[PDB]
Amino acid sequence: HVPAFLTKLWTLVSDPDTDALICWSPSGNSFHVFDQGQFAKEVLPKYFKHNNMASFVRQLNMYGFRKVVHIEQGGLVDDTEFQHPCFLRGQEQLLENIKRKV
Amino acid sequence: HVPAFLTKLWTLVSDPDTDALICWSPSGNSFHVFDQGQFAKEVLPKYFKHNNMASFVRQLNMYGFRKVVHDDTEFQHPCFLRGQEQLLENIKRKV
Amino acid sequence: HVPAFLTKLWTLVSDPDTDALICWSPSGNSFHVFDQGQFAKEVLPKYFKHNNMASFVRQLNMYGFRKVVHDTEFQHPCFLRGQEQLLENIKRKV
DNA sequence: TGGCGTTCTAGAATATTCGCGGA
DNA sequence: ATCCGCGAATATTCTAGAACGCC
Ligand code: NA
Ligand code: NA
Ligand code: NA
């Protein structure tokens, strides 16, 4: 049985209604979160028992997701991207192979 | 020498202009952050090289501050007291 | 995984828009920085969290870059124009 | 049971700053 | 006396540890 987090993350990323806040990348091999503040307060509590980005990020790391760093970050001058080799658009069956860390 | 984080943290908490986002508790044992999103994007980059709440929280734990369990986030350190800037000398950064 | 500093420095040197301040040498085995002060105040903070030339140089030394003795020229044997793949072999000091 | 979810804190690698020492 | 390269402390980012609850 696929854990609730992966099925919920799949649904909310794929949901076109939330695409303004969280959506697939063009390749469908990663997902973006735009405006962490709005995402955390409107989307997270509709799937999880919290509205905290840190608790969402902790879960992403627990399931082998890693942050994709953009070369545009790092300067003094809101787009957060995460990926997992088995989290691909149009391949929901692949979530069976994402195993949570012990 | 007191590290920049502590003097900046004392300054921004004590600043009455920011009291709507971050301010001392009534007794002044601790400080509250209201609306993490607006605080992180509007107050943090004016003191630090980032606008991210997670890096602020990481630094707080780095200096031994702990979250008091109850958008209202409260942190305390026994040597972070309103009107006692000299006490920051006793706050130890973890190595 | 190649550290941000090396990828950013590669972009900075190779970027033709910044060539007036930082660019490859003609042979492409080193890079020059012209007007160290102006470089520090306008190009550095758009790539790093500082506008400080000393902090740019400190990281260059952390990655084994050496100053070319003769505005300001730096070199690393694996920082070569047209060989971006070589940045994988630059090790940061411990 | 034991694996999962949420929270709060810490580890690890790189980044930025300051100042110094030997050449 | 100057200056390049470096040690060390702090800063920022991303990931992980640890405690506890709960079906
Ligand atoms: Na979506
Ligand atoms: Na304040
Ligand atoms: Na250039």
Numbering used by the authors:
A (entry chain B): 14 to 90, 95 to 119
B (entry chain A): 14 to 83, 95 to 119
C (entry chain C): 14 to 83, 96 to 119
Quoted from the paper:
Heat shock factor 1 (HSF1) and 2 (HSF2) play distinct but overlapping regulatory roles in maintaining cellular proteostasis or mediating cell differentiation and development. Upon activation, both HSFs trimerize and bind to heat shock elements (HSEs) present in the promoter region of target genes. HSFs recognize and bind HSEs through the DBD, which is the most conserved and only structurally characterized domain. Here, we present co-crystal structures of human HSF1 and HSF2 trimers bound to DNA, which reveal a triangular arrangement of the three DNA-binding domains (DBDs) with protein-protein interactions largely mediated by the wing domain.
Two structures containing 23- and 24-bp oligonucleotides were determined and refined at 2.4 and 2.36 Å. Different from the HSF2 structure, two HSF1 trimers bound to two intact HSEs reside in the asymmetric unit in both structures, where the DNA duplexes were stacked in a head-to-head manner. As a consequence, the two HSF1 trimers are differently oriented with a large rotation angle between them, but little conformational discrepancies exist among all the HSF1-HSE copies present in both structures. Like HSF2, Arg117 (corresponding to Arg109 in HSF2) in the middle DBD (DBD II) also inserts into the major groove and forms a direct hydrogen bond with the nucleobase 5′ to TTC. This domain extends toward DBD III without contacting the DNA double helix or DBD II. By contrast, in both HSF1 trimer-binding structures, dramatic bending occurs at both the 5′-proximal HSE triplet and the downstream dinucleotide, although relatively smaller bending occurs at the 3′-proximal nGAAn repeat bound by DBD III.
